Amino acid sequence: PSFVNPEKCDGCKALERTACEYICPNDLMTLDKEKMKAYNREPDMCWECYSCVKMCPQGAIDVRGYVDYSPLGGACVPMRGTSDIMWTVKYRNGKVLRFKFAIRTTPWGSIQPFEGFPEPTEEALKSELLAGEPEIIGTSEFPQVKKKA
Amino acid sequence: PSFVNPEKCDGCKALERTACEYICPNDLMTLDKEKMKAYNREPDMCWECYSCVKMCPQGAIDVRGYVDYSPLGGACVPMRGTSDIMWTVKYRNGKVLRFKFAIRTTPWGSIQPFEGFPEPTEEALKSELLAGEPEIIGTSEFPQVKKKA
Amino acid sequence: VYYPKKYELYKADEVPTEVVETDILIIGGGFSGCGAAYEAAYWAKLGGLKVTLVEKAAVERSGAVAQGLSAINTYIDLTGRSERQNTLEDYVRYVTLDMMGLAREDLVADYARHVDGTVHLFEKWGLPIWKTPDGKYVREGQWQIMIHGESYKPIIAEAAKMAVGEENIYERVFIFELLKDNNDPNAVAGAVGFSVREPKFYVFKAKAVILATGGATLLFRPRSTGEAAGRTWYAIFDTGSGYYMGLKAGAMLTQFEHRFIPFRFKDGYGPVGAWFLFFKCKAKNAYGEEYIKTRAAELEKYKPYGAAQPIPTPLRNHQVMLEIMDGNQPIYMHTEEALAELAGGDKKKLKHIYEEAFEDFLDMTVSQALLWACQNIDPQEQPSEAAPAEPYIMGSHSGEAGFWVCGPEDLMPEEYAKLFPLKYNRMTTVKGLFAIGDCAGANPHKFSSGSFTEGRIAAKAAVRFILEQKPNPEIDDAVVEELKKKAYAPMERFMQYKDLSTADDVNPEYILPWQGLVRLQKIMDEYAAGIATIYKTNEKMLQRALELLAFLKEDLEKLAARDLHELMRAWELVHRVWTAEAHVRHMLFRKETRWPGYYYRTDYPELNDEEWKCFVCSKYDAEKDEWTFEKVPYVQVIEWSF
Amino acid sequence: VYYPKKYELYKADEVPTEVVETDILIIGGGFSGCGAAYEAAYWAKLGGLKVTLVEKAAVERSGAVAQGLSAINTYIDLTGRSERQNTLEDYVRYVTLDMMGLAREDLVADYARHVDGTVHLFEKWGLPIWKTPDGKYVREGQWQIMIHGESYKPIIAEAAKMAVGEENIYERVFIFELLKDNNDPNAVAGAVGFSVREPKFYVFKAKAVILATGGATLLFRPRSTGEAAGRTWYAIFDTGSGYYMGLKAGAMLTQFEHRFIPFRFKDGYGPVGAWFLFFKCKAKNAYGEEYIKTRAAELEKYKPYGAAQPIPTPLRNHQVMLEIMDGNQPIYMHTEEALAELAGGDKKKLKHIYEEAFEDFLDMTVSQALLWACQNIDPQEQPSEAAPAEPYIMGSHSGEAGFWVCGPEDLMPEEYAKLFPLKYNRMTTVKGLFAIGDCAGANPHKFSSGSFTEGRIAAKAAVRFILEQKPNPEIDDAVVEELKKKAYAPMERFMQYKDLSTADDVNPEYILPWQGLVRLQKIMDEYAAGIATIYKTNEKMLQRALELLAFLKEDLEKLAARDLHELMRAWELVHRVWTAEAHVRHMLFRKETRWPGYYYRTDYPELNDEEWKCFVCSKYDAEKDEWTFEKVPYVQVIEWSF
Ligand SMILES: Cc1cc2nc3c(=O)[nH]c(=O)nc-3n(C[C@H](O)[C@H](O)[C@H](O)COP(=O)(O)OP(=O)(O)OC[C@H]3O[C@@H](n4cnc5c(N)ncnc54)[C@H](O)[C@@H]3O)c2cc1C
Ligand SMILES: Cc1cc2nc3c(=O)[nH]c(=O)nc-3n(C[C@H](O)[C@H](O)[C@H](O)COP(=O)(O)OP(=O)(O)OC[C@H]3O[C@@H](n4cnc5c(N)ncnc54)[C@H](O)[C@@H]3O)c2cc1C
Ligand code: SF4
Ligand code: SF4
Ligand code: SF4
Ligand code: SF4
């Protein structure tokens, strides 16, 4: 499960939102208004999805493998950028692996949902065609499927 | 597991020792020095042995069946005396059963460990005989067992 | 187990209500929900319709794709953009055979003819797809393509946000119940929910509602019961919410007995698809036997399903179960032999495939890489143990449990249209209520691309429904107030009875969410073909399950909650309990064992194509508290041959 | 899971040491320990010897008899005080056959010839024994007598206290390691422990030490993993402490592979002894089949064990395991039919036996009565489900795991005397160190009376040992200081690394006791023939278990504790881990399946009387960190024939 490093956590300085609390798909990350530091409120409900880890601007969040099956010592640390993500995998025995994978081929926030699509029409609303079809499918026409004789 | 009724618990502050804390075989019962009331500090380690329940002079402790398999509503309440114990079993459906069993045939604290036993001797120390034998066994002679030829 | 730092209690009458009026309400901002938001925004313009998306967490990372995915499991390729082209007929055959003969082919063929377009849009939006030097999409198996998908959800989330607008997306709002038309008992009128960030009750009024809550997990006790109870293979974030509210509304369920048991890397549940299909990894038992070989004959009795290619997943699971019952564990994924074989002595080639292997994990199930790190397992040197996880209920993956939904007018046969008051694509038996992704049953193997696609299909159908039928649902204010009281009841119960004990979690008058969940998991594990009995069950066990679920259901009326987080947990438990009941009743109804490997009815151990080659559909009537079951015979819709 | 209200931290250097000098140190104030204190106090007078009893809890209710017991399971009756007299030879035969041929008959005959005297004293001290109108002790089966035993432990505690004196009883002191003679690597010199009520380290210097800690529970994941993880059938209070400290000292273990799987009422684990033997209750599968009969054929292969009467318990277990494997659950105890048949239409008779039935539960396992109450189960109306629990390791009950101990001079054959440097009754292979009750192996079926009796035997032997050998071991102060540092190391580690995380229980540099225990339970459950595999295992699984236990043992060096309670939990975990390792190594060594029903080695499924009719004894050498095993052939000591 995830856990916050007190030395690096700043309870999200003056930003508009708390990154970890905002991103967690299972509502586990929250702030301790007293310490002004975050923590995982229910670790046995943590999917270890690393969303909080990736989104913490201070890199104050790490993941300690579930105790049920995890010997101590292992770690996976991501450094997510804009077009790629780097990972460092450290083994209990000291072995260190480094990888880097692409994550996006276009600028963030640049999606034009219906770019190049014609306007919808009441006539089209009655067809089986979805937005952009049949052009976006790549075929010479809407795909046909043989019905059982 | 066991749980303490706040209304009934007085923290044993009128006795020389805390009964539940003293009796629990798994060291679960303890006092919250703030409230001066007892509580089970680790319920999933409770054997539901009812020792604390029976020894609470205020009858402030009851047992709420483990949530894993217990529908709400059932209860077993003991009223332990000196020579017998009374039990009231209350079903989730409202049914109530009452029982009473003997627990001791002699006064408490009346045991004389070696009553009637002769004094130990160096000679006897080398035999197979335990204190009070062979007569406490019910035989005038030490029981013999046939060894295999 | 949950131990809140501090209390966050509110009484229903102290919580303000926020009314939101919309035309199309999408419940769940995961892959299917985002697909619906995207497509709905396009057609909505025809009537100036308002589209609203409600998500319990944050759309950027919510749902099953929170970590990303390493591949798109459904890409037909009708033109040759990938290394292998396929036909729609072959795909339909493939899915029906994987389902051991039972799939709504009108629904499968329908998403199949649309899915490639969705994938192409994904790439257009920035998703990096693995490509060969020649520029072809890299195939994993026959139907999947590899992707660098760490940001798969954020990309899809951006598309949805750009389409519907951020002002139409409500996050951190948990929907717990639907609202029906005061004017019509079999029509939807909206839904109710509550914020998990502040005291606020939401009342959504809508003409069309689309269920996109994902499937259900944590119904069954997992193989790890401590912290790792959180390591469910399927999305721990999905708790059968759509199933609960839809079934309560009277929408019919179908194939709810069809759970999916995933065979994955042990404990961490890392993916096996790439290892098997791409790296050509072999799975062998403790003695070095490749059981897909030694157990092949045992599938002869399942003609002609056992002769299909690929072999149906449940039958593959069955071979695993036979090995497990014979005591031939550990079962190993021989990654070391796979990497060596593929590298062919080429050290640089080894480095490349080694990086690919780790990306397969780091792009979707980091826990498995972490497990390897903690246990000092280097895949190029030693094999990894694999095992089947506990059961999960969903309709987008290899499982087909979900609502019985209407298909396209050009593919759906009369045999399948009988139970729908209105014939709109992906609409349930409840007028105005649609179901997509995991929520739509009988048409599995949708996965990420297919789920997004089904959402698009339902969204267009929803706009068509609104413009053609012109509904004007009226919510019942009396019911809304009742639901508002129920929403925060657990908090009021905690406050009312907490004084009975010096310990908040050991009380005779209430159960906390984690306590009720532990109970649910034990019941299902022991009586509903969970891991406890190697997925076996029978009439008696299922009947006892219903008895125990009845006690639990009654005890839900005594649920307590200490903060908003736990209040959501309380309703997530309620949702799972009803989902569990439906699952048990469906398993009890079908008197055969059609999917050995997923579950076995020891009292009806054989597959029965003479009496059970049908979809099992059910309807729950809340007023009478009665379940009614019906058998809908399977009919082949698409042309194909074994 | 444990969540301390507040910290209670101490550094070793700041904790005061209390040195206690004594002649005989008894570790554990349960039934065997109280028997030792009682008898030792009698003979000690011959040399003015000091006897000290140390208990981690409070003797009044500590151990397996905390709730009381409903019967005394071992009473031979050589004169006719009960409804059925028996002979010692018949008893010895009975125990050897139940053990499937392997029992130290010198030890069994020895406690048996003494046990009745103990029972007679129990009654004299106030224990109410059920009696017939004629005044005879009421028999349950052939070897047990019914008792009104709610206060069984308090009565025995009073006798021990009166004998040894309150000033010689140390309560709330947890012993975690033994001390050896500085000048003799195979002689005991005392033990170290710590208070769980205040900061105080104990150093006990003794000439003879008697291990009476009870067996080991919670090594295996239970069938209930939430609150009910606490509902272990055997005493949750016993965590293999004696096994750990004794094996670390070099005392040899025997039959440690012999776990006991109790078949009891499901979930609550209420007793079945009275129901089966006294009420003549029938056990049937889900289809009304009485499997002791329908599965009779399966026992014919075991010769002569399968033809024995009563049928050996492991074989009885085997019959139900077959039913479970076939999926014929639920398994029912038909109490309703048992009561109806026993009453014979007499309503007053029914009320009487009905009360007897409830006393059987209320006198020893109240949880089962509570379960019935919560589930609205009336035994006169409907049957109850039964099931085998997870494995437990003990030597006093139906299991015979424990230390290899010396027998009496008049019964022990030379074949069994070889490994004992000194031939004192119940002494282990370590001079001056004795083992009793659950801690003494190869002589099971002692139960309450037998355990107290074995304690009496060891106590007299200890006095004889001291007066004859005049032992005078010297503790190693350097070792003591090292042990003191280790004792509180978990608290110091918590303080040193807690700042690495904002959550006390999610830290990368340490594991808390409950976390290490969850891990231990999962390892044992999945690889050491736990419930997960219906008690099956093989060489590969056992070897993997050792690998995983190695990781865990290494991580024990990184244990943390937040208060004294958790510090005890930390050491209780340490004790269980080594016990678990010994168990795995023993199961791995024995290449046969002698006790099907308790565990199955799928790679060696048959019972082997040609090469495995021997006791498996092992020794752990701490200095070399090596385990050594040897086979001691069984020899029949007492005259009896099948
Ligand atoms: C481990 C794993 C491996 C997989 N591997 C592959 C793969 O490699 N390739 C591939 O293509 N597909 C794969 N999939 C499948 C894929 O992720 C799904 O098919 C897809 O996400 C289903 O979409 P959904 O919309 O039905 O569910 P999800 O995407 O899970 O969305 C459901 C949404 O509903 C929300 N929600 C739930 N209840 C409520 C409520 N009561 N109120 C408000 N919001 C709510 C959730 O928070 C989430 O945002 C995999 C899934 C998992 C979990
Ligand atoms: C559910 C159940 C049903 C049973 N039914 C019957 C029956 O009906 N009739 C019958 O005759 N017998 C029965 N028995 C068996 C009987 O109770 C035992 O045989 C007997 O109690 C074993 O005695 P013992 O001294 O080895 O362990 P226990 O009596 O359990 O004593 C062990 C002592 O060691 C202490 N201890 C442990 N570790 C440490 C440490 N590290 N430092 C200090 N102290 C420590 C414990 O706190 C306890 O006080 C049953 C047992 C159970 C649990
Ligand atoms: S996002 Fe990081 S810095 Fe901000 S509160 Fe969370 S952990 Fe602390
Ligand atoms: S790893 Fe995922 S599930 Fe766990 S706390 Fe972080 S964001 Fe939430
Ligand atoms: S024994 Fe009863 S009154 Fe005394 S502290 Fe415990 S619960 Fe409270
Ligand atoms: S019931 Fe027994 S184990 Fe539980 S707290 Fe009370 S005395 Fe302790």
Residues A125 and A74 both lie in one domain? yes
D40-68: string of b/e by CB count within 10 Å (b at 16+)? bbbbbebeebbbbbbbbbbbbbbbbbbbb
Interface contact A132-C121, CB threshold 8 A: yes
Residue D432: φ, ψ to 5° = 85, -10
d(CA D58, CA D216): 19
Adjacency order of strands within the sheet including A96-102: A75-80, A84-90, A96-102
Give A61's strand partners.
A4
Give the end-to-end CA distance of chain A in Å, rounded to a whole number.
Answer: 55
B117 touches chain D (CB under 8 A): yes
- Are D581 and D248 in contact, with CB atoms under 8 Å apart? no
Q: How many domains does chain A have?
A: 2
- Which chain B residue has the Cα nearest residue D229? B44
Structure tokens at D175: 């012993």
D525 touches chain B (CB under 8 A): no
Interface contact D508-A7, CB threshold 8 A: no
Interface contact B72-C503, CB threshold 8 A: no
Last residue of a domain, one of A36, A66, A96: A66
Query: Looking up tokens 């993941």, which residue turns up?
Result: A63
What are the catalytic residues of B? 47
In this complex, does chain A touch chain C, defined as having at least 3 beta-carbon pairs under 8 Å apart?
Answer: yes
| CA-CA-CA-CA dihedral for D450, D453, D455, D461, to nearest 10 | -130
Q: Are strands B96-102 and B84-90 parallel, antiparallel or unpaired?
A: antiparallel
Within 10 angstroms of residue D557's Cβ, the number of other Cβ atoms is: 12
Structure tokens at C364: 């979707």
How far CA C275 is from CA of A27, C359, C382, D81, D296, in Å, comes to 33, 12, 14, 72, 47
Q: Please report, as a single letter, which amino acid is at residue C591.
A: K
d(CA C8, CA C2): 14
Rg (CA), chain D: 24
Query: Looking up tokens 């490349």, which residue turns up?
Result: C352
d(CA D155, CA A123): 92
Ligand 6 atom having least distance to the Cα of D236: 3
Q: Class of the C487-607 domain?
A: mainly alpha
Range(s) within chain D of domains with CATH label 1.20.58.100: 487-607
Residues A58 and A87 both lie in one domain? no
- Whose CA is closest to C458, among C192, C209, C258? C209
d(CA A19, CA A13): 11
Structure tokens at D58: 């409070």
Residues B85 and B121 both lie in one domain? yes
- Are A67 and C227 in contact, with CB atoms under 8 Å apart? yes
d(CA C126, CA A115): 14
Show residues of chain D in contact with A32, CB under 8 Å. Answer: 502
Range(s) within chain D of domains with CATH label 3.90.700.10: 261-392
Within 10 angstroms of residue A32's Cβ, the number of other Cβ atoms is: 16
Q: Where are the alpha helices (DSSP H) in C344-421?
A: 347-362, 366-374, 414-417
Range(s) within chain D of domains with CATH label 3.50.50.60: 11-260+393-486+614-633
Q: Are strands B96-102 and C51-54 parallel, antiparallel or unpaired?
A: unpaired
Angle between helices C539-555 and C513-527 (to 10 degrees): 170
Q: How remote is the CA of residue B65 from the centroid of ligand 2, in Å?
A: 23
Last residue of a domain, one of A17, A34, A66: A66
d(CA C396, CA C105): 14
Rg (CA), chain C: 24
Please tell me whether D195 is known to bind a ligand: no
d(CA C520, CA C515): 9
How far CA B46 is from CA of A132, B25, C48, C520, D2, in Å, comes to 63, 9, 62, 21, 12
Show residues of chain C in contact with A117, CB under 8 Å. Answer: 42
Within 10 angstroms of residue C482's Cβ, the number of other Cβ atoms is: 11
Q: How remote is the CA of residue C230 from the centroid of ligand 4, in Å?
A: 10
How far CA C551 is from CA of B71, C520, D529, in Å, comes to 6, 11, 33
Structure tokens at C298: 């045992």
Distance of CA D412 to the CA centre of its chain: 24
Q: Which residues of D touch C (CB under 8 A)?
A: 1, 3, 221, 223-227, 286-287, 324-330, 375, 385, 514-515, 518-519, 522, 526, 531-534, 536-538, 540-541, 544, 551, 600, 602-603
Q: How remote is the CA of residue D438 from the centroid of ligand 2, in Å?
A: 7
Nearest alpha carbon, ligand 4 atom 2: A49
CATH architecture of C261-392: Alpha-Beta Complex (3.90)
Number of helices and strands in chain C (H, E): 17, 21
Rg (CA), chain A: 23
Tell me the three-class secondary structure of D544-555, residue by residue. HHHHHHHHHHHH
Residues A85 and A62 both lie in one domain? no
Distance of CA C448 to the CA centre of its chain: 11
Does ligand 4 have an atom closer than 6 angstroms to the CB of A50?
yes
d(CA D470, CA D42): 19
- Which chain C residue has the Cα nearest residue B46? C506
- Whose CA is closest to D325, among B139, C392, C626, C536? C536
In this complex, does chain B touch chain C, defined as having at least 3 beta-carbon pairs under 8 Å apart?
Answer: yes
Structure tokens at C414: 């009369």
- Which chain D residue has the Cα nearest residue C221? D225
Does ligand 1 have an atom closer than 6 angstroms to the CB of C174?
yes
Distance from CA of A35 to the nearest CA of D (A): 9
Structure tokens at D328: 């014929």
- Which chain B residue has the Cα nearest residue D360? B101
To what resolution in angstroms was this structure determined? 1.6
d(CA D117, CA D149): 18
A12 touches chain D (CB under 8 A): no
Residue C558: φ, ψ to 5° = -120, 30
d(CA B130, CA B111): 18
Beta strands in D480-608 (DSSP E): 536-537, 600-601
Nearest alpha carbon, ligand 4 atom 7: A24
Query: Looking up tokens 């790629």, which residue turns up?
Result: A84
- Which chain D residue has the Cα nearest residue B96? D373
How far CA C31 is from CA of B107, C28, C193, C215, in Å, comes to 74, 9, 21, 12
Residues B89 and B146 both lie in one domain? yes
Q: How remote is the CA of residue B30 from the centroid of ligand 1, in Å?
A: 45
Q: Are strands D169-170 and D145-149 parallel, antiparallel or unpaired?
A: unpaired
- Angle of CA points A44, A50, A54, to nearest 5°: 145
Ligand 3 atom having least distance to the Cα of A55: 1
Provide DSSP, C147-212: EEETTHHHHHHHHHHHHH-GGGEE-SEEEEEEEE-TT-TTBEEEEEEEESSSS-EEEEE-SEEEE-
Residues B72 and B47 both lie in one domain? no
Distance from CA of D329 to the nearest CA of C (A): 7
Show residues of chain B in contact with C501, CB under 8 Å. Answer: 3-6, 64
Residues B15 and B43 both lie in one domain? yes
Show residues of chain D in contact with C287, CB under 8 Å. Answer: 540
Of C506, C509, C511, Cβ closest to residue B43: C506
Within 10 angstroms of residue C483's Cβ, the number of other Cβ atoms is: 20
SS3 D572: helix
Within 10 angstroms of residue C300's Cβ, the number of other Cβ atoms is: 9
In this complex, does chain B touch chain A, defined as having at least 3 beta-carbon pairs under 8 Å apart?
Answer: no
Whether cis (ω within 30° of 0) applies to the bond prior to C310 is yes
Q: Are strands D384-388 and D331-333 parallel, antiparallel or unpaired?
A: antiparallel
Q: How remote is the CA of residue C174 from the centroid of ligand 4, in Å?
A: 18
- Within 258-287 of C, beta carbons closer than 8 Å to A belong to 267-268
Beta strands in C266-364 (DSSP E): 283-284, 331-333
Of A110, A113, A148, Cβ closest to residue C637: A148
Q: Where are the alpha helices (DSSP H) in D291-365?
A: 291-294, 313-326, 335-343, 347-362
Method for this entry: X-ray
SS3 D173: strand
How far CA C555 is from CA of C546, C550, D184, D560, in Å, comes to 14, 9, 63, 38
The CATH number linked to A6 is: 3.30.70.20
Provide DSSP, D30-65: SHHHHHHHHHHHHHGGGGT--EEEE-SS-TTT-STT
Ligand 1 atom having least distance to the Cα of C271: 3
Does ligand 2 have an atom closer than 6 angstroms to the CB of D36?
no
Structure tokens at C509: 């008058």
CATH of domain C11-260+393-486+614-633: 3.50.50.60
Residues A52 and A120 both lie in one domain? no
Residue D413: φ, ψ to 5° = -80, 160
Residues A75 and A142 both lie in one domain? yes
d(CA D627, CA D633): 20
Q: Please report, as a single letter, which amino acid is at residue C461.
A: A
The CATH number linked to B113 is: 6.20.260.10
The pick from C451, C453, C574 for probing ligand 1's pocket by mutation, whose C-beta has the most ligand atoms within 8 angstroms, reads C451
- Whose CA is closest to A26, among A2, A61, A60, A54? A2
A5 touches chain D (CB under 8 A): yes
SS3 B109: coil
Identify the DSSP state of C39. H
How far CA D69 is from CA of B49, D147, D272, D449, in Å, comes to 11, 8, 13, 11
- Whose CA is closest to D526, among D219, D263, D301, D103? D219
Q: Are strands C331-333 and C384-388 parallel, antiparallel or unpaired?
A: antiparallel
Last residue of a domain, one of A66, A91, A123: A66
Residue D243: φ, ψ to 5° = -60, -50
- Whose CA is closest to D86, among D48, D59, D119, D50? D119
Residue C140 falls in the annotated catalytic set: yes
Identify the DSSP state of B106. S
d(CA C66, CA A23): 10
Q: How remote is the CA of residue C562 from the centroid of ligand 4, in Å?
A: 21
Interface contact C500-B1, CB threshold 8 A: no
d(CA D128, CA D70): 11
Query: Looking up tokens 């007492």, which residue turns up?
Result: D638
- Are C638 and C109 in contact, with CB atoms under 8 Å apart? yes
Label residue D472 exposed, middle or buried (CB < 10 Å: 0-12, 13-18, 19+).
exposed
- Are D517 and D577 in contact, with CB atoms under 8 Å apart? no
- Are B40 and B3 in contact, with CB atoms under 8 Å apart? yes
Interface contact A6-D552, CB threshold 8 A: no
Does ligand 1 have an atom closer than 6 angstroms to the CB of C62?
yes
What are the catalytic residues of D? 73, 140, 233, 264, 360, 397, 448
d(CA D460, CA B128): 9
d(CA D254, CA D251): 10
Q: Are strands A96-102 and A84-90 parallel, antiparallel or unpaired?
A: antiparallel
Structure tokens at A97: 């692996």
- Are C214 and C242 in contact, with CB atoms under 8 Å apart? yes
Q: How remote is the CA of residue B48 from the centroid of ligand 6, in Å?
A: 5
d(CA A27, CA D69): 48
Domain interval for residue A14? 1-66
Total residue length of chain C: 642
C363 touches chain A (CB under 8 A): yes
Structure tokens at C422: 């209105």
Residues A26 and A80 both lie in one domain? no
Provide DSSP, C489-506: HHHHHHHHHGGG-SSTT-
Label residue D231 exposed, middle or buried (CB < 10 Å: 0-12, 13-18, 19+).
buried
Q: How remote is the CA of residue C64 from the centroid of ligand 1, in Å?
A: 3
d(CA D375, CA B49): 19
Q: Please report, as a single letter, which amino acid is at residue D447.
A: F
Label residue C124 exposed, middle or buried (CB < 10 Å: 0-12, 13-18, 19+).
middle
Residue C449 falls in the annotated catalytic set: no
Query: Looking up tokens 């046990």, which residue turns up?
Result: D115
Interface contact B2-C506, CB threshold 8 A: yes
B interface test, pick of D375, D436, D521 with most B CB neighbours within 10 Å: D375
Does ligand 1 have an atom closer than 6 angstroms to the CB of C70?
yes
A45 touches chain C (CB under 8 A): yes
- Angle of CA points D586, D588, D591, to nearest 5°: 105
d(CA D568, CA D553): 17
Q: Please report, as a single letter, which amino acid is at residue C305.
A: Y
